[PDB]
């Protein structure tokens, strides 16, 4: 059995979008079909329903007369028509066979992401994490006020992996994300070893390195 | 409506040791349709049990569900490593489908205090009129971390964000970066930074600070 999504993606707040969930391994038009969602760090959350038997559509009520569901089973096909898109609809979508009391959500697709945002493409800037006076020192990179995810962050071109952390982006108050990448050292080796970071935000083709000197 | 509870939020635990979750309704759920799901980072839901009790097809025996009416729990009768993950219930029952906001079922490690660590700001950044101060809380256990900022010893609210790494795959710990964002004037305005920190590892809040200049 398998449920693939597409069409998920950047919309502006008030734009529209698309769903589609092609269905394989199973007789899709004997099976209700659900949307159920999942907004970032958040639980599932129900989003919309269509019977197969004769179509039934129900809606959460926070998205009550602006999606619509619809199915077309001459293709395999479950749609979400997501209209008047809200920064809330930010989401990961995911489609599910509903079994009921034979099974519930017994089948789920991978996932697509909707994202909400009037924010407009932009690469970050990247400021050194100065170590300074156990044994042990602490430097880094902040990444800061990029649009959209994601940014990738390498130390000393991979050379550098003990101790690295490197923390989930954050939505800033100004809808640009921010990160920082983190390493412990030996005091020691300040001033003596080398220290890059290597930052790559694909979306707007930004690539820095950037000395963390002490 | 039916809204669903699931604790405890957090159940930490070793491996070998028995799991017990709950999930409580505000009203019976017809008939026990009722399911649980696990969810792994970056990964869609998986099917555990259904109808309350039923298991589902290629799920470990070790996976089971019972109770009835309003309240319900998922048993997982000794945790494989493969089995720390968060933890859905969902009704549906009605026609409005809800789900319990979760249980993350974590490793249970030896408490271990943080090292912490302060950034000031970079001067290339605060010549772009802002000045964002790090404050490093490096692998700890527990999760739970109180992490105050302090400016010129005036407790801040509002200007900082955190951030948590997922526990770490070797030694069971967490880091978490809390950051403060000042405009330049303010940062130049006052002198002392400090990031105060309480966790189960400190028997006293630890406190790193710098002056700036």
């Known amino acids: 059995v398998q449920l693939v999504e597409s069409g998920g993606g950047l919309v502006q707040p008030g734009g529209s979008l698309r769903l589609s969930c092609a269905a394989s391994?199973?007789?899709?038009?004997?099976?209700?079909m659900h949307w159920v969602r999942q907004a970032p760090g958040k639980g599932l959350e129900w989003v919309s329903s269509?019977?197969?038997?004769?179509?039934?559509?129900y809606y959460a009520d926070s998205v009550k007369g602006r999606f619509t569901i619809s199915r077309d089973n001459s293709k395999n096909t479950l749609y979400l028509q997501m209209n008047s898109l809200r920064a809330e609809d930010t989401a990961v979508y995911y489609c599910?066979?509903?079994?009921?009391?034979?099974?519930?959500?017994?089948?789920w697709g991978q996932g697509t992401l909707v994202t909400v945002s009037s924010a407009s493409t932009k690469g970050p800037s990247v400021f050194p994490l100065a170590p300074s006076s156990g044994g042990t020192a602490a430097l880094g990179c902040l990444v800061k006020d990029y649009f959209p995810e994601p940014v990738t962050v390498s130390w000393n071109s991979g050379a550098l992996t003990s101790g690295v952390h490197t923390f989930p982006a954050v939505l800033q108050s100004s809808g640009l994300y921010s990160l920082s990448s983190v390493v412990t050292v030996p005091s020691s080796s300040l001033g003596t070893q080398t220290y890059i970071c290597n930052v790559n935000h694909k979306p707007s083709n930004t690539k820095v390195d950037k000395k963390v000197e002490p | 409506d039916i809204v669903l509870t699931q604790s405890p939020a957090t159940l930490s635990l070793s491996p070998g040791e028995r799991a017990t979750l709950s999930c409580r309704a505000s009203?019976?759920?017809?008939?026990?349709?009722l399911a649980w799901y696990q969810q792994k980072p970056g990964q869609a839901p998986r099917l555990l049990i259904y109808?309350?009790?039923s298991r589902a097809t290629g799920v470990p025996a070790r996976f089971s569900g019972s109770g009835s009416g309003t309240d319900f729990t998922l048993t997982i009768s000794s945790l494989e490593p493969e089995d720390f993950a968060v933890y859905y219930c969902?009704?549906?029952?009605?026609?409005?489908?809800?789900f319990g906001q979760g249980t993350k079922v974590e490793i249970k490690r030896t408490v271990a205090a943080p090292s912490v660590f302060i950034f000031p700001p970079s001067d290339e950044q605060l010549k772009s009129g802002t000045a964002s101060v790090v404050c490093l809380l490096n692998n700890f256990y527990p999760r739970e971390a109180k992490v105050q900022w302090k400016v010129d010893n005036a407790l801040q609210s509002g200007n900082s964000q955190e951030s948590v790494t997922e526990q770490d795959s070797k030694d069971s710990t967490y880091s978490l970066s809390s950051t403060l964002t000042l405009s330049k004037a303010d940062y130049e305005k006052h002198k002392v930074y400090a990031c105060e920190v309480t966790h189960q590892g400190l028997s006293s809040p630890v406190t790193k600070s710098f002056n700036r200049g």
């Open positions: 599910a066979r509903f079994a009921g009391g034979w099974g519930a959500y017994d089948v």
């Open positions: 391994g199973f007789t899709f038009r004997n099976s209700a």
């Open positions: 269509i019977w197969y038997s004769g179509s039934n559509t």
């Open positions: 009203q019976s759920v017809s008939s026990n349709y």
């Open positions: 109808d309350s009790s």
């Open positions: 969902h009704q549906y029952s009605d026609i409005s489908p809800t």
